[PDB]
Design a protein around this ligand. Structure first.
Ligand SMILES: C[C@@H]1C[C@H]2O[C@@H]2/C=C\C=C\C(=O)Cc2c(Cl)c(O)cc(O)c2C(=O)O1
Ligand SMILES: [Mg+2]
Length: 461
């Protein structure tokens, strides 16, 4: 089965189990693409989200997201929305989203269940025109249908993209989590500005708090430990030139210089000067084996990642929660299974945060909030296992928010269609190390606060 056909038969595994989640997920995919279109490219995100109930009896909603990002070259638009790829591309740059189909899952669901086309308007940086489309995915042929295509004259300095998708939804069911999704995005994106207008006509405004944008992720070449047979054939098939196996190793991968390639070639039983387009199955097998076994690669480069940053984590926590204290940490990068990863953690304490018997726990993966399935997440487990009395929290009731961000070019999820990060040992170890680091900052704060109260009580009239 193709991913498109696997989606159609198993949409509950892809974040579309029912209309309430479809509505939520569509909003997510559009917001995530709008952010990747803006901040990855040095642009402060100015994003408008509207949701309208367009057919009351059938509970059809139109979701419209508008951004100021870099736009889509018109020639790429039909395949971007209307052609599901036959396999996921190897990830070489950090991007927002759990789901391989991205917006294409919203488009499929739209075309499966109702009759309006998708509406797209886009203007690439410096374009003299805005390109407009009404589009469908052919649900049988997995190909775009262009219903309407046109353009209008652009205005000074305008660039970006508008997408509207009509779909079955359930606003009353989805409402609180859509709001929470947006809030939690805003917390770690205080340089974005959002406007959200809901189906009931409520308007929420999330103003820009800063103009500081974190360093973007950069494309890297794949790390040898991350690739299997199929991925190597893909790399071979994609070559524009007639590289030798040696040239292939040195130029298509991370961490293979001249000497390393030589050693790899020797261990693999390959001729350096054989043309790599001629690699046989047996030869690929030995190469992959040699890759898995080789002990002398540098770690996967973290150049492909982008953190939120301690400064922004703290600013977001403080502005949203108005706590008495906030702290954060951005850890040094680690790696696993051929991909780099970074953990960040944050804590906000006291002030306007509600009293509870447990912390408010915020989970992020590649800068997207995880919303469902929180009790099965490795992040939830770590926070729950930590003994807060060791870090200065004395009462059974307290006001605390804890956040953890994992970013990687390969986030491990427990189950398709669930929003929980898997309990991978090396990732759990690092999340725990991060949390402890921030918790020590909190312990210091509480110890200083307590000494100060004691001093006033005992020494001041
Ligand atoms: C090509 C550009 C910039 C890329 O960074 C964006 C990441 C993913 C985008 C995938 C798309 O299919 C086009 C797109 C969509 Cl669907 C959207 O909802 C909002 C957008 O702003 C863009 C866009 O302009 O995409
Ligand atoms: Mg995405």
């Amino acid at each position: 089965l193709s991913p498109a056909e696997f989606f159609k038969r198993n949409p509950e595994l892809a974040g579309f189990p029912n209309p309430a989640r479809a509505l939520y997920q569509t909003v997510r995919e559009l917001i995530e693409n709008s952010l990747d279109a803006t901040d990855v490219h040095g642009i402060l995100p100015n994003i408008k989200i509207t949701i309208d109930l367009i057919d009351d009896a059938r509970q059809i909603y139109k979701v419209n997201v508008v951004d100021n990002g870099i736009g889509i070259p018109p020639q790429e638009v039909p395949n971007a929305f209307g052609r599901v790829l036959y396999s996921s591309k190897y990830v070489n740059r950090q991007t927002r989203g759990m789901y391989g189909l991205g917006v294409k899952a919203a488009v499929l669901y739209s075309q499966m269940h109702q009759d309006k086309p998708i509406e797209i308007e886009t203007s690439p940086v410096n374009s003299k025109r805005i390109y407009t489309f009404k589009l469908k995915i052919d649900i049988n042929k997995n190909e775009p249908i262009i219903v309407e295509r046109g353009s209008v004259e652009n205005t000074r300095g305008f660039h970006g993209t508008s997408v509207a998708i009509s779909i079955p939804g359930d606003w009353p069911k989805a409402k609180s989590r859509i709001y929470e999704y947006i809030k939690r995005t805003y917390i770690i994106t205080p340089y974005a500005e959002f406007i959200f207008k809901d189906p009931e006509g409520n308007v929420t405004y999330y103003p820009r708090l800063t103009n500081k944008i974190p360093k973007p992720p950069q494309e890297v070449k794949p790390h040898p430990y991350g690739v299997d047979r199929e991925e190597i054939k893909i790399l071979i098939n994609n070559l524009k030139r007639d590289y030798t196996i040696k040239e292939f190793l040195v130029n298509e991968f991370q961490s293979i210089g001249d000497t390393t390639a030589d050693k790899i070639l020797e261990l693999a039983g390959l001729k350096p000067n054989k043309k790599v387009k001629n690699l046989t199955e047996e030869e690929i097998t030995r190469l992959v084996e040699t890759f898995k076994k080789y002990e002398d690669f540098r770690s996967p480069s973290a150049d492909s990642l982008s953190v939120i940053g301690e400064d922004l984590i703290e600013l977001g926590l403080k502005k949203i929660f108005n706590p008495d204290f906030a702290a954060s940490i951005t850890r040094k990068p680690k790696a696993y299974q051929g991909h780099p990863f970074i953990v960040e953690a944050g804590v906000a304490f006291g002030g306007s945060i509600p009293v509870g018997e447990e912390p408010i726990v915020l989970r992020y993966a590649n800068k997207i909030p995880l919303i469902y399935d929180e009790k099965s997440d490795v992040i939830w487990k770590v926070v729950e296992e930590l003994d807060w009395k060791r870090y200065g929290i004395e009462s059974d009731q307290y006001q605390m928010v804890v956040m953890v961000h994992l970013c990687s070019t390969k986030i491990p999820y427990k189950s398709a269609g669930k929003e929980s990060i898997a309990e991978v040992e090396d990732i759990e170890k690092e999340i725990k190390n991060a949390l402890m680091e921030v918790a020590r900052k909190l312990k210091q704060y509480l110890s200083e606060k307590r000494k100060e109260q004691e001093a006033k009580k005992k020494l001041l009239a």
